[PDB]
Amino acid sequence: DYSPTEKILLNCGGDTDNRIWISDVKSKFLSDSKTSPALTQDPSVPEVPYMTARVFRSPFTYTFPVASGRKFVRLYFYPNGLNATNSLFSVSFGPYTLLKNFSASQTAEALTYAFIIKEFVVNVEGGTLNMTFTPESAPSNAYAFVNGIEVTSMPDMYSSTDGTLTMVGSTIDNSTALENVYRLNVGGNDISPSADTGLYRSWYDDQPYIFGAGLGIPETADPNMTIKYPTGTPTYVAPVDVYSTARSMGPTAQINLNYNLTWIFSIDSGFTYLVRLHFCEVSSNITKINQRVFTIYLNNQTAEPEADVIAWTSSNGVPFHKDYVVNPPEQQDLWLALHPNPVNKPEYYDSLLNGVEIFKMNTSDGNLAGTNPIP
Amino acid sequence: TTCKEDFANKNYTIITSRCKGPNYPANVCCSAFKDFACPFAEVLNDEKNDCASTMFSYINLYGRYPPGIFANMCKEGKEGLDCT
């Protein structure tokens, strides 16, 4: 797997996933606050680190000592003697504003989640970082709070500097900040951060994002099939449980011609989006080229005219992935859909997908914050 | 919760004589399905009942239809199929 040099799991005011946390009480990280335990307990919610919170009456800044590199940074919030609705604030790092005018409650129950986790990918030069929480001065009621904080080392996994590799569906990633908004194991089960390949990313089942009743079928690899990452490829790109499970359209070819396998993802407007799609041919029937060929549409437009996973990989059960950039038409629904391409006469009319990762790309140099979700 | 409505003795010609062939045209087939099942939108839409599964069973039995054609190719909007 990947072993991160830094694994700072910080619980504020001090789990079900075998990870040890640390209170922020005597932390060198702390640089005043009014620690309080959570007012109400929801069985669906785990105590650590959701139950304990630290509240910032006035601006607060957190510091962590880190080597030069890119880090996952994940905030943990659970909306809850102050009143929960009146919490509006901003969170900043370096020249990057991670959050602004943010409400944990209006965000959380618009989405029918008890608690929220927010994920960022940021590059840090130097040995220190800027984590500042600021209660919005705009209304007076407004305060800030954080249940917990994770900072995790990370390779430069999601950047596409190489020349002409990425263009939008109609682009350069280097020392830009990304916020992860979706991470799905398509046709598979949830994957807890322990069960990730050492990067502690949560993978969620994709089915709640299917548009209608059109689920096709889920596929899993055969037992005598071995997922082999290509030689010279990092094996922590996604868990084997992501590439061993996939979703496809169904056993009937003419039926698969009449519908798209579709997913929809609500996104913030005004940004551009990195969409990493994850592939691995798990079917025993598909072993040669021109058997399964399909078109990928992103936001009702074509991102890939003809996707043949064998042409991408030359064999069964070998993972692969591809990055795209979607620039939405200016809080919004992002469409993903696949359809079979029958031009060139493939053996089967079908489509396939193993995993999805969508990140919000920081605009210019500046904001990664979007509007608060109207429920 | 056995279905309130009886689906055994209903007249499935609405579907069988329109949704056909080796190709199951999405528009024709979804029009036919709506025509047949919109008058029972109330009972089908209720999760507690045993009716929707019983209905699809009969639809697929009298039509010899492939496995999930209606779920897969019938979609309209976020709300569902209009039926008005």
């Binding site: 209608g212 689920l215 | 939108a41 209905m55 999930g68 019938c74």
Partner: peptide
């Protein structure tokens, strides 16, 4: 009124 996708999902493909 609508035919809900929950009802349509009763036509989901099995193994």
């Amino acid at each position: 009124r609508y035919i809900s996708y929950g009802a349509l999902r009763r036509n989901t493909i099995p193994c």
